[model samples]
Target: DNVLRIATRQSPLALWQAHYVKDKLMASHPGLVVELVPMVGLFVKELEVALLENRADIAVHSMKDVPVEFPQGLGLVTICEREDPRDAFVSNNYDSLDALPAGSIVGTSSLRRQCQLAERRPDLIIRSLRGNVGTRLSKLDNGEYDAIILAVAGLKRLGLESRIRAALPPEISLPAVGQGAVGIECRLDDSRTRELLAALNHHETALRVTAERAMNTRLEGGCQVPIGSYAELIDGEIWLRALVGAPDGSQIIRGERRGAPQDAEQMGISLAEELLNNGAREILAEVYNGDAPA
Candidate 1:
């Protein structure tokens, strides 16, 4: 009996994602045993640790949570077809960002969301709200926050769709790289594991994520940076949009480009170069030097 051990963080959203993959594998390949390994800690950071430690065969993670740069020796092998990549607003009193009052507190763990929101509504206060999807929603429901931004796919998966006060407009809040996608990470040399998980890869999704990640890599940004991107393929053409900014939203660089899907990585690099040429470097330098927030 062949058993595949899958490692994932022990959050409702994580578990749901793990099970979704498990079910797909089991349904397609009979007689294969798939085991779920629940891990505790920061999902992206810890899952990478588990892979390096050989604690699990395959790791499933939300793309946004993953750092734009990967650890040495690890590779992202698969990206499941993306879901709704828009950010969702969950609040009791306000139906949308437009309704939120001035000085209202909105909770989020993403610098990307904070910076964008600050750019649009300087009067709104952004604060960190750390926990699982359910926990964060609970905080909003308890009136601890006027609103919170979450991944729409996660909220939909947890059956909490009714709690969505509004779907954050993509024009207003571009999603994080791989926001609605699930990625499978493993050692680059693990042929067996890669072959097994390869069936889960959606070619379009992979190309889009690849382009977005390439932009991230070129920019030298990490999870701490206020970076966001959205990519898609249409008629063999790839389109990308990226946002890089500071925590306080004092400065931002937003740009878009299009190219052949096969040139996904190049397209990202070219767009990044355009941004750098047009003051993105200065914006990033100030943000990286801790001057943007100050």
Candidate 2:
């Protein structure tokens, strides 16, 4: 019982989080043993399954990949401090998105990023990008894409920060719900594991993710949909920004709400409703039926 096992994806970024959490846990609790249990394919689900099967004690997750509905008997016990949540613009020739020429190809698989990029510059071409970080970068270097969009946190964690030409502002590209944060998942009834995780939880990050995820819960937004949710704490209040847009970026509904941090969940739901009433509902419906980005 003195040892804790982490189920994580084998991807470099995923392994980075696993190690980060492992190191933090060991540092806080002397004599605690932490082990990494790597998995393959889809990042979150497999790890959750490991927890359910007792193959591992905890799962380290990129908050962006976590779904609103958690598996029964399991839930997130800790949210580590967030990293830079902005999207990074990486290019070989162009220094920034604005520098790209008309009809330039930009690579990314995220519907949220595609929606925002198209809305900002309809002339630029948005294309689907797949594979790990190195593969994607190699594609860019090979002249397959004029530019690519990646999470700034991912780049920084993997020691590839120099590739980021510019970090897109939230105004231009709002981050996905819980992006750049690492959340730990464990069995719901595991009191010992929960108690051990208490010291690792970052209160402010937990509040921020709670607000953003609440908004997604109300909207039923998923990875295939173009939903942007971000929250920040200012003057001890939570400022939530949300957007639901057409995959093609022809239409977008945006809203923001500010309230006490304690009311983060309600603030998110309120903002989502405000957006829905203003046409987000239709955008999401149409996207769901068809035209969802690849």
Candidate 3:
């Protein structure tokens, strides 16, 4: 594993995480050769395909993009220490979400953010938005949007925290599963690579994400669904909270579970089941069917 191949997206934040892994690898393994692979125009699934097809030795991904199911012979073996796991509100003219004028347009590409915003402020507009952090900010400054939502983790990694008008709390927006975490996936049979990644794993972060991702997996949620799950380790217990909502902000189902960290997976699954029984499943069905409330 001296010369390990690492795959990531080509965006600046993606590369920052890639290099951060490279640095960690080098610091621990003297003389280790780290090859950073920055893929373009491909999704997280494609990154795993590279490993399955032997195109790379490892894949680094924003854990949120990763699916709960993996291709044969691959699994996420490690997660780095998490950054601030909160949503950031950025704007050129507004100090907070409450300060926005009625009918002010907001931008986000995530259904989670959009649904939450709509639920809170039915009068505000939610526009579809996508781009890197800098581009999104520029759009905000240019008045294409009154404000935009971005991850606090990305802003901090890029040294753009000063642009943040406010950090949205979990009450306003529960974080996406695995937000602010970097996960490394590799062939399950690749012992050498797994051993190398062992050093990169942060136990608390890993456990927290385990509970969060477990709920997401059980709920069968994907990028298109307005689903949010957040987990934390508190006082020797794991607390998990999750919600599924309609796009038009008409209905939302919430669930919570707490248990031993070792039982995190079960806790998450139970919560998802609770949500499902309470109508989350029907909501997700409508979402995927393109019939979500306006």
Candidate 4:
């Protein structure tokens, strides 16, 4: 059979990405057939299982949700071009975080977002928000929160961009590692499938994510940790910025680096070491000690 199967989550956003990859693959390799195997799960583990079990040829993932390391015999093959890699402030009553009044309620599921939000405005109340994009939006609309935070890319991909009141700047809310990017994983030994996917890799996006993921790996970050790492390609150099904050937002340690694109990983690791030397180590230890809210 001349079919390529993609293991994907059942979320609307996941479906959109899987379909986008299918369209790209079909167009790039004429006569190629693509199919989706929708899995029920919170994130990418189930999709990875499908790949490992030979049930799927490849798996599409929201890069930010992926773990720093892959299972043996599997590797990420393609990094699709990125979307806007910023957090969005969503609210009906407030235009922006700055516009919100004291004691306002903010909802989010990310410890990275919560740490930054609390550090900036400790007076406001931050609550955990859980659900799909639409469900979270409805929670805000139902007056459960005065404002909420979500990924801008997720909103745009789901055709709910109008819900974004403002795109938070990296200065205010640094993005999670690998945010706003799509990654594909396939068995490393599957030469045919790897060759087919080679065409989909975006060079710059790969470099950026490489740097960010390297920084995260050095920090030993978990999905729910209060860690933020972002990278950008500028003037043929990679500029990386990363931070680790306490779960209570009482301490924040930041680091930055600039280096050749080819040295992205080294730069990320160097920056992470600097951050740890400056107190990120302590902040992370506290969070990992069971204080993380997410």
Model 4: worst 10 consecutive residues (lDDT sum) = 285-294
Better TM-score candidate (1, 3): 3
The full ranking of all candidates by lDDT, starting with the best, is 2, 4, 3, 1
For residues 243-264, write the lDDT of model 3, one tens digit per residue. Answer: 9988888998888888898998
lDDT string for model 2 (1-294, tens) is 898999988888889999999988988998898888998624578888889999999999898888777878999889999999999999989888888889999999999999999998999999999988989999999999999999999999999999999999999999999989999889999999998888899999999999999898898887877999999999998899999988788998899999898899898888888888888887877867753222
CA lDDT of each prediction against the hidden true structure = 0.83, 0.90, 0.88, 0.89
Candidates 3 and 4 compared by lDDT, better number: 4
lDDT at position 152, candidate 4: 97
lDDT of 3 at 60: 89
| Model 4 accuracy (lDDT, Cα) | 0.89
RMSD of each: 2.7, 2.4, 2.4, 2.4
Task: Spell out the clash pairs found in candidate 3.
Answer: none
Which residue runs does candidate 1 get wrong by more than 4 Å? Answer: 290-294
Q: Model 4: per-residue lDDT, tens digit, 1-294?
A: 578999988889989999989988988998898888998624778888889899999999898887877889998889999999999999999888888889999998799999999998998899999998988989989999999999999999999999888999999999998899999989999999998898899999999999999898887786778899999999999999999887567887888999899999899888888888888777776767744222
Report the poorest 10 consecutive residues by lDDT, candidate 3. 285-294
Residue 98 CA displacement from its true place in model 3, Å: 0.8
Clashing pairs in 4: none
Query: Which of 1 and 2 is ahead in lDDT?
Result: 2
Candidate 4: where is the Cα deviation over 4 Å? 290-294
